[model samples]
Target chain A: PSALTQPPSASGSLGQSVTISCTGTSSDVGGYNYVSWYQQHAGKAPKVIIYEVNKRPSGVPDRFSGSKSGNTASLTVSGLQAEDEADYYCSSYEGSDNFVFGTGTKVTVLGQPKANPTVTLFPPSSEELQANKATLVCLISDFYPGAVTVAWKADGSPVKAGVETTKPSKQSNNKYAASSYLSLTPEQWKSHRSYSCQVTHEGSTVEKTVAPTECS
Target chain B: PSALTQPPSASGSLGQSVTISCTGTSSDVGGYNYVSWYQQHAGKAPKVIIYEVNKRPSGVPDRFSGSKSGNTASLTVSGLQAEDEADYYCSSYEGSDNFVFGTGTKVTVLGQPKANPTVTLFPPSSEELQANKATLVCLISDFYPGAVTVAWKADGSPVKAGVETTKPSKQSNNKYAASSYLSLTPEQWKSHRSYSCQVTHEGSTVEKTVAPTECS
Candidate 1:
């Protein structure tokens, strides 16, 4: 179990207010004043909205307020906007220099539809293949409502091991993007012949494919 | 806003191995393979010990390993030592440039005492005081049981403003340190003649005093 506890999901309409709670033990939240809160959109790094319990970092919206009572810390977002529909997390400094994070909570803006993401695949260069290593990248971008799935295939068989995919992240404009990587030896790449990157979002699938000859 | 969750504290005896867990949702930990972990001593910035989930960074000990099971990620440290006592944090890429940090956890090796810290006060340089502003620093080092209280006094009167104190941090030798800053206008500092930095730990008080005339 995590040191801090949070709900799995929270929701509110536009312009409404929503509050997320992070609960901890006396060794942490209840004992100190270093609690903080973060906001994350799909496919992005978390931003520190509130630090030191109730203090917001410079330039953060005032609507995002943090507070603590006993063992629980709370983050309250007021005047919620479409952009506010993202994941919210809370953190606290436990004693002895330890810190812990709460389970994340997804905030939904109610009535919003999932956006379709665009996918792009880049194959390894000839020089990379000559080095006996092949690198393939799948870039997924321009999606919203912050959730998607990515998969890789080589010659119609699932490419499981040696494949790395990124989390869906939020862009500056509030859209989402993600990336996936597949690394193989030159021999493995040459034998496969065909490799494909596929992304699934809101029941829609977008795919990009490449062959060994395409790189040349 | 961090993408990972962790416990507040973990403990093991010397020569024992301990594992810490980081959890995220399908949108992050379960969706991608970029989970990372960090080790932070008191009063220091966190360094990435493990990235891409299981890949240890260069110079990290082999005893530290990372793994993931579904939405939860784990970092195991084998052969725990007294020196391994510190804080641990986890982070992950959410999607599109977003990153999230875990709450922190303290890993205690058990059986340690509170060591007294050494404190020093350094006055601002002549050039800085001439610029119409002055800065004072209180450096505290070589402490254990990482917690302390710092106070500033100007000419024996309590200074209620313009003071910034850092949290107690662990040093390279497993000892702890912290710093406090006091900013003042030249007029206030020049007239005060005496400024003191006071630190209290375990009911013991240590103070260092300085003046403009003592500054080089």
Candidate 2:
């Protein structure tokens, strides 16, 4: 199966229109009309916006439209909203139960900067260890515009494995909140000494560092 | 939106082992355990093989394993068989209902060459036109190696829009068959004068051409 090609980013102002493109070959996009587009916000399951080349699923807004030209398919979002500033993806049915997806596009709504999130790190205490493993939580709150990234570090070096992060969802106050967890064996946790959770939003980063003593 | 990175191809001999790598950043793979891997044969829906970094779903073989370190995740397939030759993809949950997928990897199980498929085209007859629209079918059958590509053309130029193709599926005789449809308005069909269906298997190309008169 062949994966489709798509741009990395697209931008438009609120009330304007933005278009994202996905390109494939005769084996997939050019060979079939089973093309679909998906919309995803940070930390949530993707929702289909357009399927079967241009048909919108039930309850999808009229502002979203899809079209195809040769080996390329395009998704257009008209009257972009602040909430529309998220990621979009394209997929096609490749022959033989195989499907391929486009690399993804981030749609930025200009001039609507959301508030930066506040981050807090809650490391595991000695008494909380269970089965030689500990879980550390990073809470991010008060973010605006919704899109944010959470990262973890152990003693200033990036942590890569045994992490779980939540999708940033809007609270009743129209702000966003999300959480990330780092699972560590008690030996690794005690050896690290310090851990940090970093929240990034709009161009700035806020980091909160904690130690086992702080959690205790 | 940043997409996960993967190698374009991988190969192994029967009973051998191979590993495919997926790389992402701290905001995604490194920050979340929601990494999943899929296996796809040509023209088939991808099936999840590994989820949440290393958990194999039910019915997945123990020979398939997953692990993550830093920004890279790996899927290892041991004891490879001819059936294991297919495409592999990796997906990660980006924050907030969004997901990013890696470019696919084609896995080749070496030393296995299967028979190629034969194709035929059946265009809609004059009586089949309804509301000025017609549907043309391209039938591909008698394939040993089921993986194949079906494409369409009008006159000599490639036709990209208004086409649908199916995955090559097993026939009762243990061979495979796939079909593709081209939808057109009568005016466009008559004006186009000639159309062709092309099937590609292995390195061979088979094509059949027909006009409106031939349809009748």
Candidate 3:
């Protein structure tokens, strides 16, 4: 079982309010409220719907929101529209600046054809630095089986030419796992270079990069 | 406008591979590959479904994933279980260390449900700073009628007492804005303290935090 909490399924009408809850142990959400929310539609990449809990990115609608109480974190979509029909998620900071995702929820609109939907990325609980290595790893948990892929590239180019990778597989506890690794030279690591690992499954794409620290 | 790209929608079967795409201009995903993804259900907070694009956090199944192609980013979920039904999102760092999010997709599973879901957080495009009086902002550029609340607390203690937070209001050209401030003394900033910011709307919570340097 994962440390995060989420509902299996939910339903609502257009222009109404809906809420999903994410509960965690003391090591994660219980100790802090570094939570966030996102929205996704069929065949597309998820996007930031909310960040730092309730704070919307520059363009998110006020109807989608985030909040926390004790060890439980929550996300609410108000004035829900037909286009808001999609999956929603909750996450919070684990120790070491890591973040974990709660089980996802599917949103159903009661009316006409749904329009464009939005997703959000909350900052991770913390960050991870692989000891003594120039590389860092960001982990996303709480995914379903056969729902993702992992890859890495350096400076917009695939790393090492003969890069190694793994396929998304099922976890013992009935979830999913996927991973990718990239190795960089100290020169590439020290510069403001970009190393990206892209996830492509379900016809959507999400990528992340890491930049070198400035010399003191 | 902000820097992000996304498809209209996507689809996949349970336990099958699904991919979503997020494209950005040269100033956004192009320069950075530290892409991330999150999952959100109707009325819930967003959760980290993919981080560093693909690495699964500890205990996450081997199914959720991430990847990238030039300025286009991808998130893939394999072995799609019924419970995987939800919205997915993608995020990345942009020029000037600005973080960005893509439009989202809805994942609809067509089979049996799973037991529990997981969440994960990726390495931030930004890093933790030791400076006193640090300021962090959450900017969403796509949605309107923004309603949000932001708050800060140190080591679980509320800071800046008696401050009223308001919902986001539209800016010029139909944009929205909302944010919170943290002013810490040098001692508090240096004591390896942890600070949190909570954003809430419609009774949901999305939280994020900043931690000081840790002692050896």
Candidate 4:
């Protein structure tokens, strides 16, 4: 378990402001001076935006500031830009050589398009259909505001087991994508049943289906 | 020049807290939100202590925290531990994926004993006298705090151009050590001159004299 806690996410519009909170105990945050904040982009190293409660480095702007009250420290970013959207993290120094970090939070700018994912379903491969175990794949791609829920259904009945959906991943165009897999036996796949992959993104649902008659 | 500036060093005692600062400007630090802080030990990769402002990572302890003010960021180490004595760096995000780092600060913890250095001087080797340069070495070892000044003198007068002193290096036992070299010509060395190596550490100066006759 982490010694510090933070909200999982935060958001603000361009030209607006957002604040993040990091809460700890007196043995760490509330009692000490070594508090800091960072700004990170996808897959890249983070940069220091705030340190020692509320100080900026040479290139840091005035829009970024920090503060503390009791056992909690806060980071505020004002005059937000679309470029400001990324992950943020906090840290504290404990006595001795030990240190603790907070659960990271993702910051979002509101102007981004909330596009839905394009759902695609593929039947078991010919090679796999010849084997005892058959597999089906559900590819969901090109979505925005990546939050998504996925499901598998066979003959209109929900299929819970042998199904796994991946967390949303970012793409080169700043879009999000995901994948889900459904496993089945060769006999089950050839039983004339229809299977579908359903994805719900940004309050809308999209689905793709395949039938044994077409695939077999 | 770096986009960030920092104090060269900081200090605290075990069970106490310390603060380090990083100052910046509007271009990288104020304009964007991609700043971060890192904690690094000797000869190791840096670890992100804070990201996207005030969030921490899962594996870090809670003793380190961050803050920010106008054009300045700060990192504080609380409830000091002997383990916190390491180099800390701050960085700022520039527009379009560009970034800069702080000058870096070394934090000292008042945990170890104030031991003095053992000074040793080696005469120019008999083989070296046959060459154009006769270089003698002064070895300073086993000192705490790592601060020392070196001087080379000949015939009771100071020598400058042919003297060089290296930075203090840490030993396995956490003590500090350094080296100083004095260059002299064979003709200059044998002129009945009394050459010496002097090291000032912890407020006391130690000198070792070597005459050409003794070396020969």
Candidate 5:
């Protein structure tokens, strides 16, 4: 929640214009000239597209423009391109050297195809075992429409503790990769007998499993 | 920083009164009737003292009062007591079902004598080593004026990553207790050969070195 409010999401077809609005009060957006807008692609930092109420930053394309009226600020994209489908946020300077960030909006372009990720699960290394702990890693790669869900299990039972997932990171080849980690004690790792990682991308679930390896 | 602006700290002497301010925009504190205030001791949950801009909830004393002027909201504590020295935060409903929290202000009552905490550092247990990790814990107890800085060193070298310090917590005796933690690899812990915890209270500093059973 913030002093500024925005719709959680907005969508329009490719080549169509899209407009998003951020509403604030006289103490911030409506009252100040320091309003700014940022665009962020998946797995990347935000880039300034608009600043100072409606001025475009150098190097930003003319397609992304900003405007303000009364207590509301607007950002409009003209002839939207595929790359323009990203998260957008608005901000304004509040008094006493503080600033307020909008909740942000996820912009989607219709008719784009959804894709899945290739998954991999790695077992705990011997160094971890010698130190008496187990660390399992799951790698998710080559996904489109970056949003994803990651889950873990031990011998068919759900796992929650010591689990962390990374945000989707774009690759040099333009795909995405993410990692999830699961920590366990050496005893738990050995006694559990099996561990699995499940990842859901675009509503399709992919899984991989790994256990303690041994000699035949 | 937040959408709401507040003074970093406010002060008053015991038996006197103090006032703290939270300033927001017209879209929030000034535009709505949903202003609220909270009181929080360190390491504790916040308790509501005032709600909906000037209403004191049940169990709140008459000593606590709330008022508003334009875009600014005020919280007043009449006849401040020793226990009344705590953090205060203001909140307001912004719009579209979102809420904004104030940056918070720490209130200190004068005339109370500053006290120091007894310090103790505990080495990692065997289970931690067996799990490939070393967690060092430092217990700080019985402090007054409740502001302290904690530092850690491995073989006289400063440590930063994996260091965590708990907030000052009020104990049953009305004094304060806090804990600082440091995480390390077993090899890193053993290789260092020595570790120390340093705590600074008021203007004076106290330190404890982790030793092997204190050499009996």
Candidate 6:
């Protein structure tokens, strides 16, 4: 899957423009226009923001925009308002049934501009460096009630996957999340440069990459 | 989207077997697993024969099988006979929110030994005209004990729709199906293309499509 590079947080004035970058390798974002954007409030289904890379579905406001250059895809929210403070996510279609989401981004209404809110891509919650058969799991771990979509990517392109991804029911905290497994053959794993576990919460996206210890 | 060519109707003995085929333009069978099959009895809701192109969702019997090559998507039902006699539809994802359904096929459960059944696709229903605005009032007249979801599609793609469905109203007889309307613009109507009406009952899928036509 694609490696995820994102800011921990991004802050702007009430009416200012803010661009959240979702950077990855060529396999995930390069050739195909598989990327999508979404938004979610406290207790609502995630609304599709951008699909087919940059096309907005009906009823979407103009303030939401998507663009891609090289291997990088971005979702820009202009004229930011307090309501826009909810989370946002970027997804890419992976295979026929799987989709990958970035570890989500939190947009707090920045009344007083402190440091720009930074977005961070944390390390994999559980590390698995097995040689042959291993599972890479990515979890949102936080969010209000709702179901989340997870995906797997190579560079920026989507890869064919199986039913390893499982959607868990909402927890007591009313947060929605999911996990996926990559069943790898010994040769496939050995040659694979890197893989990422991406999670989507509402519109926010997050990911973690696994690097082979043998590699410098 | 690709044009479809199939026999209009087929016949077989009550305890025999039969099959149907749906052909696409390019590689609907290769790139994506969006193909699906559905069945509709005389006056009841439609039921899914196949979903996800090959795999049956659930409760769908193994008698139904799906196969594809290059641009052709086919569905075959083994042990075909009397109870299986009904209208059949083939559908697949056509990028974006669009889904294409083949013109429906009607099968007769012949009770006696007869010649081989001939299948073809032509002479679409009179109710469907080139982009002249169409609607299928499914359940407005009768009541089904359970409620169902209704949606409209244009040229195999989903169009934004408005629907009014009522709760199951028990008249003297059993409940009836809900009423639904599928509308298209003059251009959409003019294409004289096939349109589909899909219904879901307790998770089962059934759909029917009008034959392709060119409005004079």
What's the lDDT for all of these models? 0.71, 0.71, 0.53, 0.70, 0.71, 0.51
1 or 4, greater by lDDT:
1
Candidate number with the higher DockQ (1 or 3) = 3
For model 6 chain B, give the 10-residue run with minimal summed lDDT. B116-125
Clashes of each: 35, 21, 140, 80, 1, 62
Per-residue lDDT of model 3, residues B38-118, tens digit only: 676644555666677566555456777788777887877777777676767677754332367666655655332211111
DockQ of 4: 0.01
Candidate 1 lDDT at A204 equals 75
Per-model i-RMS: 22.1, 27.6, 22.0, 26.6, 15.9, 25.9
lDDT of 5 by residue, B89-160 (tens): 787755432356676676878544556776656665443455676666666666775646678987888887
Stretches of candidate 5 exceeding 4 Å from the true structure? A1-8, A21-35, A40-47, A52-54, A67-74, A79-106, A141-181, A187-194, A200-203, A214-216, B1-216
- Cα lDDT for residue B214, model 2? 41
lDDT of 2 at B114: 56
Full-model lDDT, candidate 5:
0.71
Write down the TM-score of model 3's second chain: 0.47
The DockQ value obtained for model 6 is: 0.01
Kindly list the per-residue Cα lDDT of model 2 for residues B1-216, writing each as its tens digit. Answer: 456776644666688999988888787777677788987665444566787889886567899999999789999998998888878878786654246677567676654445566555555544346335566666566665555656789988999886655544555555565556676788788878788888766557788886765422
- Give candidate 1 misplaced runs (Cα > 4 Å): A1-216, B1-8, B21-58, B65-75, B81-106, B161-164, B169-175
Give DockQ per model, in order: 0.02, 0.01, 0.08, 0.01, 0.03, 0.01
- What docking grade does candidate 6 earn? incorrect
Residues A82-199, model 4: lDDT tens digits: 6677788887877654456777788887787677886656566443344455666666666887688989998888998877655565654466656666668878878847888889
lDDT of 5 at A176: 59
Candidate 6: regions farther than 4 A off: A1-4, A112-216, B1-216
Candidate 6: residue A178 lDDT (0-100): 31
True contacts kept of 6: 0.00
